[PDB]
Design an enzyme around this catalytic site. Structure first.
Site, PDB file in Angstrom:
ATOM      1  N   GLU A  80     -65.816  43.347 -48.887  1.00 59.20           N
ATOM      2  CA  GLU A  80     -66.316  44.305 -49.853  1.00 59.20           C
ATOM      3  C   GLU A  80     -66.830  43.579 -51.091  1.00 59.20           C
ATOM      4  O   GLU A  80     -66.277  42.550 -51.488  1.00 59.20           O
ATOM      5  CB  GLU A  80     -65.221  45.314 -50.230  1.00 59.20           C
ATOM      6  CG  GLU A  80     -63.974  44.720 -50.876  1.00 59.20           C
ATOM      7  CD  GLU A  80     -64.111  44.553 -52.370  1.00 59.20           C
ATOM      8  OE1 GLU A  80     -64.988  45.219 -52.955  1.00 59.20           O
ATOM      9  OE2 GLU A  80     -63.342  43.766 -52.960  1.00 59.20           O
ATOM     10  N   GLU A  82     -48.364  13.816 -48.522  1.00 59.35           N
ATOM     11  CA  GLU A  82     -47.074  13.242 -48.889  1.00 59.35           C
ATOM     12  C   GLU A  82     -46.008  14.323 -49.027  1.00 59.35           C
ATOM     13  O   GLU A  82     -44.949  14.251 -48.387  1.00 59.35           O
ATOM     14  CB  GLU A  82     -47.203  12.417 -50.170  1.00 59.35           C
ATOM     15  CG  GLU A  82     -45.912  11.721 -50.570  1.00 59.35           C
ATOM     16  CD  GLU A  82     -46.067  10.861 -51.807  1.00 59.35           C
ATOM     17  OE1 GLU A  82     -47.182  10.819 -52.364  1.00 59.35           O
ATOM     18  OE2 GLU A  82     -45.072  10.231 -52.224  1.00 59.35           O
ATOM     19  N   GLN A 109     -59.436  40.574 -51.814  1.00 54.71           N
ATOM     20  CA  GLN A 109     -59.379  40.890 -53.238  1.00 54.71           C
ATOM     21  C   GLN A 109     -58.297  40.084 -53.943  1.00 54.71           C
ATOM     22  O   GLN A 109     -58.519  39.565 -55.042  1.00 54.71           O
ATOM     23  CB  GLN A 109     -59.139  42.386 -53.432  1.00 54.71           C
ATOM     24  CG  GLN A 109     -58.941  42.795 -54.878  1.00 54.71           C
ATOM     25  CD  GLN A 109     -59.201  44.267 -55.104  1.00 54.71           C
ATOM     26  OE1 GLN A 109     -59.091  45.075 -54.183  1.00 54.71           O
ATOM     27  NE2 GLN A 109     -59.552  44.623 -56.333  1.00 54.71           N
TER      28      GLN A 109
HETATM   29  N1  LIG Z   1     -51.269  38.460 -56.800  1.00 53.44           N
HETATM   30  C1  LIG Z   1     -52.156  39.437 -56.637  1.00 53.44           C
HETATM   31  N2  LIG Z   1     -52.048  40.293 -55.561  1.00 53.44           N
HETATM   32  C2  LIG Z   1     -52.947  41.289 -55.390  1.00 53.44           C
HETATM   33  C3  LIG Z   1     -53.982  41.459 -56.292  1.00 53.44           C
HETATM   34  N3  LIG Z   1     -54.722  42.513 -55.887  1.00 53.44           N
HETATM   35  C4  LIG Z   1     -54.180  43.011 -54.755  1.00 53.44           C
HETATM   36  N4  LIG Z   1     -53.079  42.264 -54.436  1.00 53.44           N
HETATM   37  C5  LIG Z   1     -52.200  42.467 -53.275  1.00 53.44           C
HETATM   38  O1  LIG Z   1     -52.891  42.068 -52.110  1.00 53.44           O
HETATM   39  C6  LIG Z   1     -52.720  43.019 -51.081  1.00 53.44           C
HETATM   40  C7  LIG Z   1     -53.958  43.068 -50.195  1.00 53.44           C
HETATM   41  O2  LIG Z   1     -54.888  42.089 -50.600  1.00 53.44           O
HETATM   42  P1  LIG Z   1     -56.262  41.892 -49.785  1.00 53.44           P
HETATM   43  O3  LIG Z   1     -56.131  40.808 -48.744  1.00 53.44           O
HETATM   44  O4  LIG Z   1     -57.393  41.601 -50.738  1.00 53.44           O
HETATM   45  O5  LIG Z   1     -56.500  43.325 -49.102  1.00 53.44           O
HETATM   46  P2  LIG Z   1     -57.312  44.465 -49.889  1.00 53.44           P
HETATM   47  O6  LIG Z   1     -57.023  44.401 -51.369  1.00 53.44           O
HETATM   48  O7  LIG Z   1     -56.965  45.819 -49.317  1.00 53.44           O
HETATM   49  O8  LIG Z   1     -58.849  44.115 -49.571  1.00 53.44           O
HETATM   50  P3  LIG Z   1     -59.388  44.204 -48.060  1.00 53.44           P
HETATM   51  O9  LIG Z   1     -58.510  43.371 -47.161  1.00 53.44           O
HETATM   52  O10 LIG Z   1     -60.811  43.707 -48.002  1.00 53.44           O
HETATM   53  O11 LIG Z   1     -59.335  45.644 -47.613  1.00 53.44           O
HETATM   54  C8  LIG Z   1     -52.439  44.339 -51.772  1.00 53.44           C
HETATM   55  O12 LIG Z   1     -51.495  45.082 -51.040  1.00 53.44           O
HETATM   56  C9  LIG Z   1     -51.871  43.942 -53.118  1.00 53.44           C
HETATM   57  O13 LIG Z   1     -50.475  44.121 -53.117  1.00 53.44           O
HETATM   58  C10 LIG Z   1     -54.096  40.602 -57.375  1.00 53.44           C
HETATM   59  O14 LIG Z   1     -55.010  40.750 -58.180  1.00 53.44           O
HETATM   60  N5  LIG Z   1     -53.180  39.591 -57.546  1.00 53.44           N
HETATM   61 MG   LIG Z   2     -60.654  44.666 -50.311  1.00 51.83          MG
END
Ligand SMILES: Nc1nc2c(ncn2[C@@H]2O[C@H](COP(=O)(O)OP(=O)(O)OP(=O)(O)O)[C@@H](O)[C@H]2O)c(=O)[nH]1
Ligand SMILES: [Mg+2]
Ligand SMILES: Nc1nc2c(ncn2[C@@H]2O[C@H](COP(=O)(O)OP(=O)(O)OP(=O)(O)O)[C@@H](O)[C@H]2O)c(=O)[nH]1
Ligand SMILES: Nc1nc2c(ncn2[C@@H]2O[C@H](COP(=O)(O)OP(=O)(O)O)[C@@H](O)[C@H]2O)c(=O)[nH]1
Ligand SMILES: [Mg+2]
Lengths: 412, 429, 432, 439
Positions: free
Chosen positions: C64, C247, C11
Site C-alpha cells: 500500500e 561475530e 507499515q
Molecule cells: N513498532 C511499530 N509497530 C507498528 C507500527 N505500525 C503498525 N505496527 C504494528 O505492526 C503490525 C502490522 O504491521 P504490517 O506488517 O505493516 O501490517 P499492516 O500495518 O496491516 O500493513 P499490511 O501488511 O500491508 O496490511 C500491526 O498489528 C501493528 O501492531 C509502527 O509504527 N511501529
Molecule cells: Mg499496510
C-alpha cells in the site's frame, strides 16, 4: 445578537417561494420552533438545548425604559455584580456571514455541531493540516530550537522566568550594567513622581531594557506588588525581586568590604570620591584581558553608581544593592568572592577564593629571621612614587598587624 | 485505490448526496468542482472518490439510480448537485410503485443495461478499482430492487473487488409502508450473497440518536443522512488520508468477516455531543471509546448487549497516541468478556487515521459484527410471514412477474442467516 | 567496507525505518538533503556519490502506498533514493496468503532487483537487516517471500530480522495470530537472528521510565532505532572490543533453529531525571537485566539464559563490564543454562549514544543494549499458538486465506513448526 | 487530586450553592464564562481550582457540583441566569414536581424517578476525579425534597461509594422561628437518614445567622442572599486548607476523625469570625486572640445553641490569612484558662487547629469587609442535645393526636416510621447525655 437579521426571512426564499420545509428557519408565520408546544420564551422541555444553539436570538430588546425598571429578582440582583456590561466565540462580534452559515447548517461534522462556538476550531484545523509523522520528523535544527497555591506563586514564577531570560541574554567595563539598565528603563518609562508604574509603562520598561513581557505578565507583577490597590506598584520592589535575594556568603563579603571602607574613611563616612579613588579596577577580568581600560572601568563604575554628585554618600543599602547587581549577574560564588577580594584588598579567603591582590612581603627581622607575610587592607597604600613613603607605610601596617621586630621589607 | 459509489432509490440518492457533500467538504471541493483546500493532504488522494476533467473539475465517481425523475431533479437542485456528471444519472419513466418485482424484474431490469455500461466506464477510468459502494434502502422498491440487481451483476463482472453496501433497514416504529417486509425479505438474500460487507442503518436508531444523544429539537432526514454520511466517510478515511494504522476495505473485511455468510455489521459514530454540552465534554480517546460501545450511540436499532460481538472495527481519526486507544479496547474486552466471544481473541481491530473530521479534534467510526444483527431479520421475519399467510398484497408481486416460490426462498435464506447468528450467539469452546 | 543493507517491509517496517534513519543521519552528521556542511564511517549505512551526497542503503517496501508516499513527501525526500522506495497498489489486508501468493510475486522481482543493485553498490556487504511485523500481511507475506528469495540468492549472508510480534494482550488485529504462526515458517529457516520487538514492553518502559502521558509509535520506533543503532555502532565506530555481524551471530546462536532473541536497552531515562541518578556501568547493567527494563514481554525468570550479548556505548570500561558480569553471575535471580559456562559476549564502543532532540531519551554519557538468547522465549510461542488454536479449532478467518492461493494444510505446517520450535527450546533448556 | 464534589439538594441547597459557587469563582478568578483570564494562568498551572473546578480541552473550568431540586423554578432560573455558561446543561438536574414539605413524597414517590439519573450524574462527576476527597451535601432538612430526596441520595451514595468522606451542611429548623408547620416532621424523619449515612453534619439554622448579621455584620435587614453568602464563606474557610497551602493543613479526613469520637456523634455547631462590615471593623484591632474569643462566644455562632449549657467535646479551628501558630497557641491557652466554656473530661486536648495563607475574599456588591485574617470554628459538643430536644418536643406535640399524618401516609409511608424516627432521636438524646456525663 442584536436585531436578529439572520433569523429574518431572506431574499432567496421570497424569490423561490421557499417554505419552512426542509430548512426549518421559522421565518414564516406558524413556523416558529415550538418546544413543549410553547415558544423559546415559554421554557419547557428542550428549551435549554435550544437556547444553547449558536443561531439563537433571544427576543429581548437591548434598550429598556427607566420608568418601570422594577422586575429584578433576588438571584438577578445577587449576580448583577459579576454580570458583564453591554456595549473567536463572541456571538455579538459575529458577522451576518457566519450567522447565515450557521442558519444554513453547513460545514458541520455531525448534526448539531457548533464550529463557531467551538473555541479551538482554528488550532484543530491547523493540526488537521499536518500528519503525525510529518510533525514528528521535522528537520532537526528547527526541531531542536522548538525544544504552588500561594497568592504570590504565579508572580514568583513570572520572576523566575524573567530572571532566567535575563541570564540567557547575559550568556560592560564594570559589572552591574544589566540591573542598572533595567532600573534605568523602568525609571524612564515612569510618568509618576513617586515611582508608581502601570501595566503599559512596566511593559515598555521591560521592552526598553531588553525583556519580552506579556501584558498579562506585567499585570500579574503589579497585582502581586501593589499595595494601594490601583493596579500600580513601585518599580524598585519589582527590580529587586527580578535581581533576587542576596546570597549569605556574598552578603557577608559585601558587609566586610563596607566595614573596611568605613574604617578607611577619613571622617568615618563612606564617600563617592574616596570610593572611586580606592577601587582598584585594574584587577577586573576584562581589564586583565585588555578588553577595557582602567579609565573606562572607573567611568563605568561611577556611571552605574548613579550618584547625583561626585561626593555623594554611600550607605548600607546603596552598597548592598550595587554589589547585589554584580552578585546577580555573576553565577559562581567562588569567582564573585575572588573578584570582590581582589578589587577591595580584603585579606582572607580559602583556596580559590583567597585574595591575591594584597602585596606579599618578605620581611627580615632584627634577628635575621626571614618570613613571608601578607599585608592586610592596603587600599590607600598605593604607588605614590616615593619608595621611602611606601616602605614606611608597609612598616606601619606591619606594626599595626603585630610584627614589631621588623628590619627590612621587600615586596615579592 | 479507487472506490466508486452508486446510490439507488430516493433514500439512497439523498444519503449519497449528503455523503458527497461531506466528502467535498473534507477535500475542499466546491459545487463547481474546483479546489480551495489549504492542505496538500486534501489533494494528494483526491483520486479515490474524484476524477479530474480536462478543465480540472473534480467529478465524483458516482452512479445514480431511481425510476422517478423527481429524485434526479432534487439531486441536481441540491447545493452539490452539479458536482455529478450528467451521464451518471439513469432514471426511468414511471415510478417503481415501491414494488421489488417492478424494480428488479421488469422496469429496473430493462433500465440496468445503461447502469452497467456507465459503471464499467467508471471502472475502466479507475486506475486500480479499490471497490464498489452502494447506498440504498431495502424497504423501498427501487432502492432495494435495483440495488440488489446491480450488486448481483457487479459480483460477476467484478468478483475480486469489494462490495460495501449501506442498506437502510425498515423497522416497525418508523414503518411507513406495508410492503416493507416483502421488499426486505426479497432483498436480504441478494445482500447475503452479493456483498462483501453489508452494513445496516435503521431510522429508529437514527431518531434515537437525534433525540437523546444529540438532544436536537427538530433534525430531519437531512440530519439522519448527515450522520450516515459522517460514518460513510469515516469508514474509508484511511484510504484518502495517512495514519499510523493504515486500513482499507479489504483490511476491514478480513478482520470483520470470520465466515462468508457473516458480513452484516452495526454502525456507530463518535463523538456525538449535544450542542449544549459541546463546550463542556472534553474530547478524549477514553470518552470516545466509552461512547462507541454504548447501545444508544449505535446507529443499529438492535440492542448490542443482548448479542455477543463477533468482531469489531474502530476507525479512529485525529492525532492520538496508540496505547491510549489500544488499552481502551483491552478494557472493553476484559471488563465485558461476556459480551465478546471467547474463542475469538482480541475481537477488536483498531486503525488510526491522521486527519480528523474537518474542524474536530478527533473522532471514531465503530463497525461491529454482532449476533444482535439477527433481530432485524427476525422481526421482519414475522412481519413478512404474517402477511404471506393469506396473500396480503402478494398479487402485485405475482402479476408483475414474480412467482410464489421466490418469496419462500427469500424467507428461507433469511431464516438460514438468522440461524447462523443464533448458532454463534450461544457458541461455547 | 562493513556495509549493511537495511530493508523495511510493511507499515511497521516503514515507520521503524523512518525513525532510525534520522538517528543515523544525526549520528553521522547527515542533513535531510544528504550533505555535511562543516573519515569513512557512514559507509555502513550511506553510499557516497561524487556530488558529495550520501544515499542510504535502504529499501522500503509496502503493498500500500500511504506510508511510502508519506516518506516521499516528508523531510527526507531529498535523502532517500526515488527508486528502492517502492510501492504497490493494494495492501495485503493482514492476509499472509495475499501477501505471499497473489500480490507477492508482482513486486518481489522488483524488490530483488533493487536489493541486487544495493549489493552491487556495496563492496563489503556484511549482511541484511530486515524490519517488519509478523502480525501484518505485508510483514508476514512479503517478509516471507523476501526472506526466501534472499536466502536462495545470497547464500550464507548474515540476516537480522528486527521483527515486531503480537503482544500478549495489547494487539490491533484479529487474524494477527494467524499471520504470526504462518510467518514463523519463514522466520525459522530463512532468518539468521530474529529479534523480538513487541509493543507492550516498549509501552511499559516508556510509561514507567519516561513519565510520558501520551507516547505512541513515534516514541516506540525512536526506541527501536536507538536499539538498532546501539547494536550496529560496533563496526561503524572504533572501540575497545568491536564486534561484527557474524561475530555476535556465532556468539549468540547455539543451534541453527535457536535464533529468536530478547532485547533490552538502558539507561532509558528522561531529561528531568538524567542528572540525578548514578548512571554507572553496574547500574545500567542491572537495569538491563531487570525484567521490566527490556523490550519484549517475556520474563526470563521463568526461563534460563543461554547467551547474552552486551553492547556498551560511551566511556564504558572493560573492567566496569567485567564487574557487571561478576555481579550478574553472583546474582541468582537469573539462571544460566548448565552447558554454557561463559554465556557473555560484551563489546565496547567509544561513541556515546546520540539522542535525537524532542524525543524521550536524554543525553547520557554511556549506555548498554543486551541481545539475549534464552529459553524463556518459549512463552511467546506458547501463547501465540494458543491464540491461533482458539480460532483454528473450527478455522475462522481461513476462507480469506484459501481464496488467495493458500492450501488448507499450510496452517498445519505452521502448527508443526510452532510445536518443534517450542520443543527444541525445551530440549536445550533441559538439564543434562 | 484532592477533588471534592458538591451536591446541592432542595431550594435552600440551591441558593447556598449559588452563593458558595459565586464565592469560589471569585476566589479562583473564574468569570461567569468559566475561563480564567490570562493573568490568572500565565504564572504557573496552579492546581488550586482542581478540587472545585475541572478543566476542559478549551481551558474552561466546570464546577464539580450537582444541582438537584425536584421543582424546576430555582434550577431553571439558575440556568437562565448569568452562570449559564459557567454551569453545564447536565450536572444541573431539575425534576418535575416538588415534594411540598413531604418527606414521604420526596423519598417514595417523586424521589425514585430522579434518583437513578442523579446517581448517573454523580458517577460522571466522580469518574472525572482522580483523587476525589469526598462529597459535600448542601441542604435543609425542613424542605420536603431536601429531606426525602436528600435522604435517598445519601443512602445511594453511601451504598455505592462505601466509606467515602461525606460532609453535609444542613439547615435545621430554628428553635424559635420557622417557616413550615410540617418542618418538624421533615426534620425528625430525615434525622435518621443523617445519622445512618452522614459522616459529619454541620448546623446551619436560620435565626442564629440572622441575629449574627444583624448585630455583628450590622446588616439591619439582610435577606436570604446575605445568609447564603455567610454560609458560603464558612464553607470556603473550611475547604481552603487543601486549595491553598498553610503552616498547618487539614483535609476532608483530618477534622472528620478529630471531630467524630463516636460514629453516632457527628453533629457539629459552626461559627465564623470576624463577620464585620466596613464600619465596625476599622475601630477594632482584629487580632488572632480577638477573633478566637469572638468565635467562641455564643453571640458569634451560626447556630442558635449556646455552649454555656452545653459541654464541649472537640473544636476544629480553620485560620485564614496572616495567622501565626504562636498566636493560635496563645488563643488556645486563653480559651483553656477561661472558665465560661468547659471541655469534656475525657478529651483534654480537644483542639484541631489549621492555618492557611489565603485571606478570605469579599464578593463585590456584598457586605463583608475584606479582612486580613479570619477563623472558622466547628465544634462537636453536647449542647446540640438542646436543639434536638426542642425539635423532638415539637415533633411530639405534632404527633400527640396524629396531625399532618394523612399527607405522609398517602405518599407511601407506613405509620410506624414516625415512631421509629422519634425513638432514634430519643436514643440520640440519650447518647448525647451519656457522652456529656462525667466519668
Ligand atoms: N513498532 C511499530 N509497530 C507498528 C507500527 N505500525 C503498525 N505496527 C504494528 O505492526 C503490525 C502490522 O504491521 P504490517 O506488517 O505493516 O501490517 P499492516 O500495518 O496491516 O500493513 P499490511 O501488511 O500491508 O496490511 C500491526 O498489528 C501493528 O501492531 C509502527 O509504527 N511501529
Ligand atoms: Mg499496510
Ligand atoms: N439558609 C437558607 N435557608 C433556606 C433558604 N431557602 C429556604 N431555606 C430553608 O428551607 C426551609 C424549607 O425548605 P426550602 O429550601 O424552602 O424548600 P426545599 O428544601 O427545596 O423543599 P420543597 O419546599 O419541597 O421544595 C425553610 O424553612 C428555610 O429555613 C435559603 O436560601 N438560605
Ligand atoms: N435516513 C433516511 N431515510 C430515508 C430517507 N428517505 C427515505 N428514508 C426511509 O426509506 C423508507 C422508504 O423508502 P422508499 O422511499 O420507498 O425507498 P425508494 O423506493 O428507493 O424510494 C422510509 O421508511 C424512510 O424511513 C432519507 O433521506 N434518509
Ligand atoms: Mg422548592
Amino acid at each position: 445578537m442584536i436585531g436578529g437579521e439572520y433569523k429574518k426571512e431572506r431574499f432567496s426564499e421570497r424569490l423561490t417561494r421557499a417554505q419552512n420545509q426542509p430548512k426549518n428557519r421559522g421565518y414564516l408565520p406558524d413556523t416558529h420552533l415550538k418546544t413543549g408546544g410553547y415558544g423559546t420564551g415559554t421554557l419547557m422541555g428542550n428549551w435549554s438545548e435550544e437556547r444553547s444553539d449558536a443561531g439563537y436570538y433571544d427576543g429581548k430588546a437591548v434598550v429598556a425604559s427607566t420608568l418601570r425598571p422594577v422586575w429584578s429578582t433576588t438571584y438577578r440582583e445577587m449576580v448583577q455584580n459579576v454580570a458583564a456590561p453591554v456595549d473567536r466565540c463572541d456571538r455579538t462580534q459575529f458577522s451576518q456571514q457566519t450567522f447565515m452559515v450557521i442558519e444554513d447548517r453547513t460545514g458541520r461534522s455531525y448534526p448539531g455541531h457548533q464550529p463557531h462556538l467551538d473555541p479551538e476550531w482554528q488550532v484543530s484545523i491547523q493540526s488537521a493540516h499536518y500528519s503525525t509523522s510529518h510533525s514528528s520528523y521535522i528537520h532537526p535544527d528547527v526541531q531542536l530550537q522548538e525544544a504552588g497555591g500561594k497568592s504570590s506563586s504565579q508572580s514568583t514564577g513570572v520572576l523566575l522566568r524573567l530572571r532566567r531570560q535575563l541570564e540567557l541574554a547575559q550568556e560592560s567595563a564594570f559589572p552591574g550594567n544589566v540591573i542598572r539598565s533595567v532600573r534605568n528603563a523602568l525609571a524612564e518609562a515612569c510618568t509618576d513622581s513617586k515611582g508608581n508604574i502601570n501595566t503599559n509603562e512596566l511593559q515598555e520598561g521591560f521592552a526598553a531594557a531588553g525583556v519580552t513581557a506579556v501584558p498579562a505578565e506585567c499585570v500579574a507583577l503589579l497585582r502581586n506588588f501593589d499595595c494601594e490597590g490601583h493596579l500600580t506598584a513601585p518599580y524598585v520592589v519589582i527590580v529587586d525581586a527580578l535581581r533576587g535575594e542576596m546570597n549569605c556568603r556574598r552578603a557577608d563579603l559585601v558587609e566586610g568590604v563596607y566595614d573596611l571602607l568605613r574604617s578607611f574613611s577619613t571622617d568615618g563616612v563612606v564617600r563617592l570620591d574616596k570610593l572611586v579613588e580606592w577601587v582598584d579596577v585594574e584587577q577586573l577580568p576584562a581589564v586583565k584581558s585588555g578588553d577595557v581600560s582602567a579609565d573606562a572601568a572607573r567611568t563605568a563604575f561611577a556611571e552605574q553608581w548613579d550618584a547625583r554628585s561626585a561626593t555623594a554618600h554611600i550607605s548600607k543599602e546603596r552598597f548592598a544593592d550595587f554589589f547585589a547587581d554584580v552578585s546577580f549577574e555573576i553565577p559562581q560564588d567562588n569567582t564573585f568572592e575572588l573578584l570582590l577580594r581582589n578589587i577591595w584588598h580584603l585579606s582572607g579567603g580559602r583556596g580559590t577564593c583567597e585574595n591575591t591582590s594584597c602585596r606579599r612581603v618578605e620581611v627580615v627581622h632584627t634577628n635575621g629571621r626571614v618570613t613571608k607575610e601578607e599585608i592586610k587592607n592596603d587600599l590607600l597604600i598605593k604607588d605614590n612614587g616615593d619608595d621611602a613613603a611606601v616602605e614606611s607605610l608597609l612598616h606601619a601596617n606591619l606594626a599595626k598587624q603585630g610584627i614589631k621586630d621588623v628590619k627590612s621589607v621587600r615586596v615579592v | 485505490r479507487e472506490i466508486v459509489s452508486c446510490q439507488a432509490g430516493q433514500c439512497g440518492n439523498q444519503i449519497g448526496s449528503k455523503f458527497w457533500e461531506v466528502i467535498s467538504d473534507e477535500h475542499g471541493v466546491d459545487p463547481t468542482g474546483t479546489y480551495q483546500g489549504d492542505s496538500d493532504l486534501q489533494l494528494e488522494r483526491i483520486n479515490v472518490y474524484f476524477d479530474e476533467s480536462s478543465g480540472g473539475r473534480y467529478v465524483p465517481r458516482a452512479v445514480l439510480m431511481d425510476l422517478e425523475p423527481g429524485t434526479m431533479d432534487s439531486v441536481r437542485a441540491g447545493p452539490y448537485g452539479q458536482l455529478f456528471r450528467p451521464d451518471n444519472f439513469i432514471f426511468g419513466q414511471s415510478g417503481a410503485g415501491n414494488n421489488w418485482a417492478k424494480g428488479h424484474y421488469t422496469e429496473g431490469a430493462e433500465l440496468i443495461d445503461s447502469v452497467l455500461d456507465v459503471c464499467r466506464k467508471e471502472a475502466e477510468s479507475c486506475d486500480c478499482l479499490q471497490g464498489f459502494q452502494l447506498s440504498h434502502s431495502l424497504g423501498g422498491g427501487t432502492g432495494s430492487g435495483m440495488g440488489t440487481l446491480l450488486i448481483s451483476k457487479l459480483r460477476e463482472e467484478y468478483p475480486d473487488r469489494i462490495m460495501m453496501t449501506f442498506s437502510v433497514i425498515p423497522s416497525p416504529r418508523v414503518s411507513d409502508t406495508v410492503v416493507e417486509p416483502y421488499n426486505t425479505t426479497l432483498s436480504v438474500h441478494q445482500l447475503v450473497e452479493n456483498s462483501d460487507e453489508s452494513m445496516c442503518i435503521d431510522n429508529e436508531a437514527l431518531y434515537d440518536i437525534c433525540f437523546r444523544t444529540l438532544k436536537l429539537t427538530t433534525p430531519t432526514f437531512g440530519d439522519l443522512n448527515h450522520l450516515v454520511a459522517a460514518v460513510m466517510s469515516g469508514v474509508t478515511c484511511c484510504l484518502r488520508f495517512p495514519g499510523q494504522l493504515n486500513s482499507d476495505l479489504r483490511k476491514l473485511a478480513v478482520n470483520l468477516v470470520p465466515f462468508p455468510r457473516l458480513h452484516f455489521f452495526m454502525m456507530g459514530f463518535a463523538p456525538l455531543t449535544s450542542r449544549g454540552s459541546q463546550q463542556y465534554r472534553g474530547l478524549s480517546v477514553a470518552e470516545l471509546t466509552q461512547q462507541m460501545f454504548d447501545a444508544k450511540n449505535m446507529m443499529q436499532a438492535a440492542d448490542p448487549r443482548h448479542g455477543r460481538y463477533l468482531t469489531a472495527s474502530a476507525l479512529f481519526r485525529g492525532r492520538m497516541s496508540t496505547k491510549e486507544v489500544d488499552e481502551q479496547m483491552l478494557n472493553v474486552q476484559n471488563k465485558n468478556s461476556s459480551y465478546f466471544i471467547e474463542w475469538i481473541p482480541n475481537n477488536i481491530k483498531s486503525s488510526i487515521c491522521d486527519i480528523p473530521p474537518k474542524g474536530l479534534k478527533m473522532s471514531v467510526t465503530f463497525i461491529g459484527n454482532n449476533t444482535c444483527i439477527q433481530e432485524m431479520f427476525r422481526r421482519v421475519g414475522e412481519q413478512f410471514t404474517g402477511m404471506f399467510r393469506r396473500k396480503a398484497f402478494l398479487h402485485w408481486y405475482t402479476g408483475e412477474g414474480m412467482d410464489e416460490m421466490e418469496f419462500t426462498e427469500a424467507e428461507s435464506n433469511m431464516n438460514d442467516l438468522v440461524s447462523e447468528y443464533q448458532q454463534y450467539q450461544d457458541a461455547t469452546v | 567496507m562493513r556495509e549493511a543493507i537495511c530493508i523495511h517491509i510493511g507499515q511497521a517496517g516503514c515507520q521503524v525505518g523512518n525513525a532510525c534513519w534520522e538517528l543515523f543521519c544525526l549520528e553521522h552528521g547527515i542533513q535531510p538533503d544528504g550533505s555535511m556542511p562543516s573519515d569513512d564511517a557512514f559507509n555502513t549505512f550511506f553510499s557516497e556519490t561524487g556530488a558529495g551526497k550520501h544515499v542510504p542503503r535502504c529499501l522500503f517496501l509496502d503493498l500500500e502506498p500511504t506510508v511510502v508516499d508519506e516518506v516521499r513527501t516528508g523531510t527526507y525526500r531529498q535523502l532517500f533514493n526515488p527508486e528502492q522506495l517502492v510501492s504497490g497498489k493494494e495492501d495485503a489486508a493482514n492476509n499472509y496468503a495475499r501477501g505471499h501468493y497473489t500480490i507477492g510475486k508482482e513486486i518481489v522481482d522488483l524488490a530483488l532487483d533493487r536489493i541486487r543493485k544495493l549489493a552491487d553498490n556495496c563492496t563489503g556487504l556484511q549482511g541484511f537487516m530486515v524490519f517488519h511485523a509478523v502480525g501484518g500481511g505485508t510483514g508476514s507475506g512479503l517478509g516471507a517471500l523476501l526472506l526466501e528469495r534472499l536466502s536462495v540468492d545470497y547464500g550464507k549472508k548474515s540476516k537480522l530480522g528486527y521483527t515486531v510480534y503480537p503482544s500478549p494482550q495489547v494487539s490491533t488485529a484479529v487474524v494477527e495470530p494467524y499471520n504470526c504462526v504462518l510467518s514463523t515458517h519463514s522466520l525459522l529457516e530463512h532468518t539468521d537472528v530474529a529479534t523480538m520487538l513487541d509493543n507492550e514492553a516498549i509501552y511499559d518502559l516508556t510509561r514507567r521510565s519516561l513519565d510520558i502521558e501520551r507516547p505512541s509509535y513515534t516514541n516506540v520506533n525512536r526506541l527501536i532505532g536507538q536499539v538498532v543503532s546501539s547494536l550496529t555502532a560496533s563496526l561503524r565506530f572504533d572501540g575497545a572490543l568491536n564486534v561484527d555481524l557474524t561475530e555476535f551471530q556465532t556468539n549468540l546462536v547455539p543451534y541453527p533453529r535457536i535464533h529468536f532473541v530478547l532485547t533490552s536497552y538502558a539507561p532509558v531515562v528522561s531529561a528531568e531525571k538524567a542528572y540525578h541518578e548514578q548512571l554507572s556501568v553496574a547500574d545500567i547493567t542491572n537495569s538491563v537485566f531487570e525484567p521490566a527494563g527490556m523490550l519484549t514481554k517475556c520474563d526470563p525468570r521463568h526461563g534460563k539464559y543461554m547467551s547474552c550479548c552486551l553492547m556498551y556505548r560511551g566511556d564504558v570500561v572493560p573492567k566496569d563490564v567485567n564487574a557487571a558480569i561478576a555481579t550478574i553471575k553472583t546474582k541468582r535471580t537469573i539462571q544460566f543454562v548448565d552447558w554454557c559456562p561463559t554465556g557473555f559476549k560484551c563489546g565496547i564502543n567509544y561513541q556515546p549514544p546520540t539522542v535525537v532532540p524532542g524525543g524521550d531519551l536524554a543525553k547520557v554519557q554511556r549506555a548498554v543494549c543486551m541481545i539475549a538468547n534464552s529459553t524463556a522465549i518459549a512463552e511467546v510461542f506458547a501463547r501465540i499458538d494458543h491464540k491461533f488454536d482458539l480460532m483454528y479449532s473450527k478455522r475462522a478467518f481461513v476462507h480469506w486465506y484459501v481464496g488467495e492461493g493458500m492450501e488448507e494444510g499450510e496452517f498445519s505446517e505452521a502448527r508443526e513448526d510452532l510445536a518443534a520450535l517450542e520443543k527444541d527450546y525445551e530440549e536445550v533448556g533441559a538439564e543434562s
